[PDB]
Amino acid sequence: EFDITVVIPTFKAEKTVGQCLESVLSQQGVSTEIIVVDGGSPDATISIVQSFSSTNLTIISEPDRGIYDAINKGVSRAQGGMIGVLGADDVYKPNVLSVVKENASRGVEIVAGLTLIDGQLRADEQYRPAALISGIPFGHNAMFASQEAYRKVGLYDLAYRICADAEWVHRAIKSDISCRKVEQVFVEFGTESNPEEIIAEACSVIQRNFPFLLKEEAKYLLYGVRGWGETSRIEQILRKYGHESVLFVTALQEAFPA
Ligand SMILES: Nc1nc2c(ncn2[C@@H]2O[C@H](COP(=O)(O)O)[C@@H](O)[C@H]2O)c(=O)[nH]1
Numbered sequence: 001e002f003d004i005t006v007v008i009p010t011f012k013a014e015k016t017v018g019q020c021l022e023s024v025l026s027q028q029g030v031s032t033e034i035i036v037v038d039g040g041s042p043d044a045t046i047s048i049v050q051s052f053s054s055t056n057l058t059i060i061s062e063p064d065r066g067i068y069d070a071i072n073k074g075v076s077r078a079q080g081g082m083i084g085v086l087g088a089d090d091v092y093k094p095n096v097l098s099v100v101k102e103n104a105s106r107g108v109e110i111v112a113g114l115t116l117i118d119g120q121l122r123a124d125e126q127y128r129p130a131a132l133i134s135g136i137p138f139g140h141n142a143m144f145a146s147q148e149a150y151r152k153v154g155l156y157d158l159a160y161r162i163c164a165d166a167e168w169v170h171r172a173i174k175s176d177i178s179c180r181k182v183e184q185v186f187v188e189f190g191t192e193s194n195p196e197e198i199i200a201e202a203c204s205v206i207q208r209n210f211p212f213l214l215k216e217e218a219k220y221l222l223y224g225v226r227g228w229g230e231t232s233r234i235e236q237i238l239r240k241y242g243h244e245s246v247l248f249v250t251a252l253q254e255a256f257p258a
Pocket of ligand 1: 009010011012013037038039064065066067070086087088089190
């Protein structure tokens, strides 16, 4: 079979899909499956992907309902023990896939690494209940999840077009999926959405973790942890809902130590 499966969603990615695939095919010490899920690109995207044409490259090209819909197609078709997602304008760093296989050999379900964005490290958080009241704890492209992890968590929720990665990881946390965080850069993200749109999805994700929360309550927790608002009502929300979930108590204790 394969150690790794790399799912690459693409739509009009002729500028960079080459560099993307180069960073995957040069990975040493691993048998890797590449699944390019194209959304019906009208440009030279498909012909560039076919230029490589390795025996381990599968090309899907058809209209889809978004990045996460295309991801879901690739994940379902993956045959490698560990599955990563790489944007066509991202690149893995050298030796990353071998590190993923190394950690996967010891039984870890999720292997996540650091993320380089415009020459700076992504400000990652911890894979822990506190993440449930914030965003995705690490860069999504820096994440690798085993077949078993996906079988037990499921696919990405297409109702979330921006924060579906955070919503999947929060479910992985809620599912008690093991995670190893590697303090090394896995991915170099490419920088070339309306804030309210993201804030709306983030709050909705938080409510999906803790349905007993209203919109403003989730937003107040979001703004409180993110530093955009005051944290005077944090104690009221713990008492108001503490009895509902120990996870919610744990998430608040980790996030707001005072
Ligand atoms: N298959 C598919 N890929 C998409 C769609 N929209 C964006 N992508 C791809 O998903 C990745 C997103 O990276 P971005 O360019 O947004 O940083 C890129 O590889 C981009 O081409 C889509 O609707 N369908």
